[PDB]
Amino acid sequence: PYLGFCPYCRHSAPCFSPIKIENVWDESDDGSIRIQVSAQFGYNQAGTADVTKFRYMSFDHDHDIKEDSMDKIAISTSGPCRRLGHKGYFLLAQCPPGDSVTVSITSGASENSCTVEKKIRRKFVGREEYLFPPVHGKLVKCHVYDHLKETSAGYITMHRPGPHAYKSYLEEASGEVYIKPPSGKNVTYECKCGDYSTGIVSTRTKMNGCTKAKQCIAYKSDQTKWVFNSPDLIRHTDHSVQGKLHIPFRLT
Amino acid sequence: RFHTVIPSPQVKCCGSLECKASSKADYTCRVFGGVYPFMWGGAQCFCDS
């Protein structure tokens, strides 16, 4: 459930959301649209399949994995879009024509949206334009994204998450830098405060020679998860391919 | 249509990095100096220079 840097959040500015889009496909002859966001869908808190809810990233310095329901996600390009299906990392929906696509979660009054530009154009199949597939007509060859959840258009590669620094972990007191890990989590830290230094602290620990809070970094070793090869994360030292997951909704 | 995949970036943010040579299609790599990049804390580095 990584969170990354959307170019357009709710208000005006680029900022970090769990539901950034990064890429979009629009080649299905029906106009069905497949979207990839950093969030997940159809999985419960531990990751086990549960259609009615989804899990995503937390806006806190503990930065755990939080959850919500399907009834409060919305897709819209020019008007609201009708969701057709969802599978973990991926969404698919029908959208009206427009210039950009927006995914929005409405956790009550907590609105978090990402928008990305994509000139989606009403397309058709045949030698004549038409608004809708007519009741009567010839049956010709077309290609539409398969609504089935368990299809596969390909695979995407996932890797161990890299370092993810924080500042609540760090603190400045009387010109000395201390670390404040959360409860029971072995948090690795490093810096040069003069000479270089590294280790892991699970409790509030002091640092020597450290005069400024900006001098050091601390973060917990969360190797129990795999993250997409997103361009808005600093990867781990070893970026070996460690997981592949299917790209649902194969263009059948 | 090519899909342009951009791997996750890397920082050796007070050492030195070199762009190696890969075998990927139209592979491109480059190195930058002082960047001091922020992601969600507001600092991911020591030695801002």
């Epitope: 690795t188 830290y189 040069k192 000479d195 270089y196 230094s197 590294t198 280790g199 892991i200 602290v201 620990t205 002091k206 640092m207 020597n208 | 050796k12 050492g15 030195s16």
Partner: antibody, heavy 130, light 112 residues
């Protein structure tokens, strides 16, 4: 002041086991690789094992499968569990702190591989006899 | 494993005169930084070894100036310029640039 106290040694039977502890003070304990070295009576010392600040553990060849070094940074200690005791394990064991844990170059800054041991504890005697 | 050899095994000395301890490695001990990981320690009877020299030429703090370290490659020497009575004890060279760390067998320095 930097200080290392060793404890847990004494008399033991061959084939037995014992846990040694080294409590450290006066410096950032989590920031350094801790070493166990040994010197049995009348011989030179003998490096036994090291645990990095990243919990990476290396051992001498003579101590494989029997000695396990561990560490807790919260209470500032490094321990050595010893199993399958034998006669030549009889020695004074010294808990040792490197003055420097690594150095930095243009390719980055590196871990455990050291240049010198700056601090030694008083050491604790282990005597394996029948 | 790096083999470290010291000579002489016994070095009777006289106060007021210089003395030297010679040290050979089976391998080079230079790092990528160019610093060489050789260190000289003194051990007194009933006491843990105390660092004298690190980075063959650099003297540790509080060490008397009469101690000095020289050498390169695999050949190294510790020189006492003016032996004192407290200087008796067992002197060891050790290295840390190669795993496992290796130390010289040691030289006993005693007053003639």
């Amino acid at each position: 002041e930097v200080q290392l106290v060793e404890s847990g040694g004494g008399l033991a039977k061959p084939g037995g086991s014992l846990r040694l502890s080294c409590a450290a003070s006066g410096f950032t304990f989590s920031s350094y690789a801790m070493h166990w070295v040994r010197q049995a009576p009348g011989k030179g010392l003998e490096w036994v094992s090291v645990i990095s600040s990243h919990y990476s553990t290396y051992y001498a060849d003579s101590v494989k499968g029997r000695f396990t070094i561990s560490r807790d940074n919260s209470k500032n200690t490094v321990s050595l569990q010893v199993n399958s005791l034998r006669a030549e394990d009889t020695a004074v064991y010294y808990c040792a702190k490197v003055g420097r844990s690594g150095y930095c170059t243009a390719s980055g800054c590196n871990a455990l591989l050291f240049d010198w041991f700056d601090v030694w504890g008083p050491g604790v005697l282990v005597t394996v006899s029948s | 494993d790096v083999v470290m050899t010291q000579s002489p095994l016994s070095l009777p000395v006289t106060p007021g005169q210089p003395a030297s301890i010679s040290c050979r490695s089976s391998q080079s001990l230079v790092h990528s930084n160019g610093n060489t990981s050789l260190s000289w320690y003194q051990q007194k009877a009933g006491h843990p070894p105390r660092l004298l020299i690190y980075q063959v030429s650099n003297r540790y703090s509080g060490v008397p100036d009469r101690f000095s370290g020289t050498g390169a490659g695999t050949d190294f020497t510790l020189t006492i310029s003016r032996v004192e009575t407290e200087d008796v004890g067992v002197y060891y060279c050790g290295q840390g640039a190669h795993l496992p760390p290796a130390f010289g067998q040691g030289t006993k320095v005693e007053i003639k």
